[PDB]
């Protein structure tokens, strides 16, 4: 059948301020079918116990999910989201950029 | 509340 690859946005719940607790979000959307693998990474390593929203979908039938974890940003630490889907030959990594 | 629709199939 026809498949649709995920759009990916990585961002924080609130404007980032170093040393102030926040939530790191990875929003995946526009994909079909629904099976998808999403990891949040801190300095390249998988964060444990990440939570996610309940599967739902948009008016065009494509799925979306929010993955999220509490975190405290610093100048040093790098964060990213890593996504795999049947449409991707290898996992896609999107880095967190505070201005996006 | 959800729709209760018994005995309807494709």
């Amino acid at each position: 059948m026809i498949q649709r690859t995920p759009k990916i946005q990585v961002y924080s719940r609130h404007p980032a301020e170093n040393g102030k607790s926040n939530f790191l979000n990875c929003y995946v959307s526009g994909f079909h079918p629904s099976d998808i693998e999403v990891d949040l990474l801190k300095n390249g390593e998988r964060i444990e116990k990440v939570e996610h929203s309940d599967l739902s979908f948009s008016k065009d039938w494509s799925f979306y999910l929010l993955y999220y974890t509490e975190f405290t940003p610093t100048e040093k630490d790098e964060y990213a989201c890593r996504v795999n889907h049947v449409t991707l030959s290898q996992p896609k990594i999107v880095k967190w950029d505070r201005d996006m | 509340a959800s729709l209760n629709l018994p005995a309807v199939s494709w």
Binding site: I2, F23, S53, D54 | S2
Partner: protein, 276 residues
Amino acid sequence: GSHSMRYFYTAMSRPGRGEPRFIAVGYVDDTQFVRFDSDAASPRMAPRAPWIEQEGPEYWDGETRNMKASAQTYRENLRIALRYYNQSEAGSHIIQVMYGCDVGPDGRLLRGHDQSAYDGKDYIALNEDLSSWTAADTAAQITQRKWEAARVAEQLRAYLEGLCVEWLRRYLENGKETLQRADPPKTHVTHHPISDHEATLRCWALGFYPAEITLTWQRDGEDQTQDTELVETRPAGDRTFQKWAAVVVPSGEEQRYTCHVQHEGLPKPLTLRWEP
């Protein structure tokens, strides 16, 4: 203002890995309030918003019974769809359903919905008359014939005009402090040089509810639709939404650009500019 209630079902087959998973979620406007997942250790319709928690055990028991019955219906529908499309028992397939009602400020029905998809493509939809169907292909026409013979549209109409609207009105009253509150966007413009010759202006909207918003850039008062990068509206995780719109502008021309924001929480549209 106006409001909606929607239920979304996803049924996903997985041959060799048990029976199809069935997940249901319910929303009022952009607020999820219930979920059901057949893969949970103890499947139940469960609350996801504070204002639904006050419903009593008869509500939760009835919703759970209905979701279990719906899971069985959609597992059968997945088997039927294989026959209708001449497909093998080896592949994974998906049925999706969305249904519900929209009401105006008076709480009266504006319109009802009931539409389904197979493998991400339209399958069958109840028309706006709540009395006839649109089938996407010759497979869905088989379903349409069965549903015409059994007067299924009449049952959908009874729900959409009756219990759907009545429950939505109850939820809106019980959740009035949030469901009937619009949070306007918090807005600002950022500027990032990309070269000596150009810079990005990015217009941000944060903290808004509901999700519907319009963010536009104008240059000299003319919309820049084909030159604007507009990200999908995204959830913050605290009920609110975020969005941005960006344009690449010639250095020294920044004040020719204005960002325009429309949102139901704003009494008047906002115009903003980069403020160095």
